[PDB]
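ok so dumb question maybe but i'm new to this and my supervisor (M.) told me to 'just get the structure for 5,6-dihydroxyindole-2-carboxylic acid oxidase' and walked off. so i did the thing. is this what she meant?? sequence i used:
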Amino acid sequence: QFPRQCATVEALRSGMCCPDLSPVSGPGTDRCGSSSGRGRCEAVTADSRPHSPQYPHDGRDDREVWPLRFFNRTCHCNGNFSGHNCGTCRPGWRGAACDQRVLIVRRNLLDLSKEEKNHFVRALDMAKRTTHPLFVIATRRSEEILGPDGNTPQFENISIYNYFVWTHYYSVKKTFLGVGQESFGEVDFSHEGPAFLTWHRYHLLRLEKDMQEMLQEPSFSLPYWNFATGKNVCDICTDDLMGSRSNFDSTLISPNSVFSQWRVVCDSLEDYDTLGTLCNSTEDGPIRRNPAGNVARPMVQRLPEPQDVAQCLEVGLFDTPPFYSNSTNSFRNTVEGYSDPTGKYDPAVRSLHNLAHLFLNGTGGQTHLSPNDPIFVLLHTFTDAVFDEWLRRYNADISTFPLENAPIGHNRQYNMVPFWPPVTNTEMFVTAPDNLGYTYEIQWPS
Ligand SMILES: *[C@@H]1O[C@H](CO[C@@H]2O[C@@H](C)[C@@H](O)[C@@H](O)[C@@H]2O)[C@@H](O[C@@H]2O[C@H](CO)[C@@H](O)[C@H](O)[C@H]2NC(C)=O)[C@H](O)[C@H]1NC(C)=O
Ligand SMILES: *[C@@H]1O[C@H](CO)[C@@H](O[C@@H]2O[C@H](CO)[C@@H](O)[C@H](O)[C@H]2NC(C)=O)[C@H](O)[C@H]1NC(C)=O
Ligand SMILES: *[C@@H]1O[C@H](CO)[C@@H](O[C@@H]2O[C@H](CO)[C@@H](O)[C@H](O)[C@H]2NC(C)=O)[C@H](O)[C@H]1NC(C)=O
Ligand SMILES: *[C@@H]1O[C@H](CO)[C@@H](O[C@@H]2O[C@H](CO)[C@@H](O)[C@H](O)[C@H]2NC(C)=O)[C@H](O)[C@H]1NC(C)=O
Ligand SMILES: *[C@@H]1O[C@H](CO[C@@H]2O[C@@H](C)[C@@H](O)[C@@H](O)[C@@H]2O)[C@@H](O)[C@H](O)[C@H]1NC(C)=O
Ligand SMILES: O=c1cccccc1O
Ligand SMILES: [Zn+2]
Ligand SMILES: [Zn+2]
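this is what came out, is it supposed to look like this??
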């Protein structure tokens, strides 16, 4: 969603989201930091190439050709400057001139020290309570975004971590067709398509960045959870980490973990998909988590085996037609978990990433809701670690990431929805240590 400077009547009317950086001569005098050389307000590029025939409602959904339904001009920054303002630096760069290299290391959560484990847990908790300094979220779609009286932007403040939940929600929600009509659900701007891995990579980079600024610790890094152990249990679900099971309710988190106090956002689908509203910042209800608990679905009662990871990393093409959840021999569909680890499609199979979600048999395994469970962060840095090893191993071969006829949202040059500033899948399709300022301390099975 959008910088608070752009969630106004004026900015949405002008179609321009190009905020000032240091307005020393008055408002509008330093848009995108043009006073210095940091950037310039510029026309948006959005993907205009066709998508797969599965989405038939072109013209109906604000996520199409993102961000054009809200803004057609944004800040484009020069050099290694970056941000909605061009006021910060691109990943891997710090300093006023964006010329100092940083490399942060994402490590296995179980390898952290007693203190490092405690620091991480409290930092997640701080992000859950701390208002995001920059972004606000919409509670209405574009037709109602200026509110009933036409002068009241329908945006809410939201915490650093709940923004992380909301953007995942917004990417997966159904297309609203109107009161009385059933919303359309064969659409997903962050799953079931090639954008899945790059979407989720930016997802993590933006949370990590937000927490660095919240903590004022430039080197803070999100750890990972090696869920590919074949285990029957959740080895990070302990009270010094992500929280153990409640002895008073098998589906709740131990009261001796702060995460039992969290309350989730976006759990009112029945309202959103009938009234046409969007998830707002009001929390409601605790995290439900029940590892291995899906007795009705035995396939999701055990986690992935180690070799599952070693096998999926031998799939050498990033994606294959039809670039969807039923692709075969697609690395993306394999690690996403709709193929078996060799790449062989099967409508039944759930493996790796999908399996790790469903193993939680709770909030973490529901599509509109799953970042509400903070295991999500660690589940996806590990998924991102596998992706990064693939990028290393096959020379970041983006050729099979399709430029057209992908499911809507997944064309290569699509701006990933709804991140801001606009950022394409291509911008994330790079090896992380040289291009994004982070690397993984990890070892792979042979
Ligand atoms: C760039 O956008 C302006 C502003 O319009 C907004 O932009 C989009 C997000 C879309 O949602 C528009 O409906 C928004 O109003 C465009 O100028 C407006 O054009 C409309 C007709 O299309 C007109 O009724 C308004 O008066 C115009 N507003 C202003 C301030 O002139 C502009 O045409 C767009 N330029 C492009 C796409 O190149
Ligand atoms: C993958 O699933 C898709 C969508 O369910 C199937 O693709 C086509 O879908 C269009 C409408 O989107 C229909 O005309 C057909 O059902 C599909 N085209 C065919 C069968 O030629 C597709 O069949 C699936 N791919 C597989 C199973 O390999
Ligand atoms: C924030 O979201 C909640 C959940 O959708 C909204 O509360 C619902 O509002 C509908 C109709 O207004 C009621 O029928 C439901 O019973 C409400 N749910 C709950 C849990 O109270 C709430 O109105 C939204 N806030 C804003 C400002 O839109
Ligand atoms: C957690 O697992 C239970 C089953 O172990 C799920 O409940 C089952 O849901 C299916 C499909 O909705 C029903 O056919 C079964 O009758 C249910 N069984 C029981 C014992 O409840 C539950 O939906 C799962 N929850 C999540 C979030 O995954
Ligand atoms: C959102 O909240 C605004 C508060 O602005 C600032 O936000 C963070 C950084 C906190 O430090 C807070 O204390 C600050 O004041 C309010 O002005 C307003 O209620 C909200 N604005 C909108 C558009 O919803
Ligand atoms: O976001 C998800 C939520 C629930 C289950 C499986 C896979 C997901 O990516
Ligand atoms: Zn997801
Ligand atoms: Zn996921």
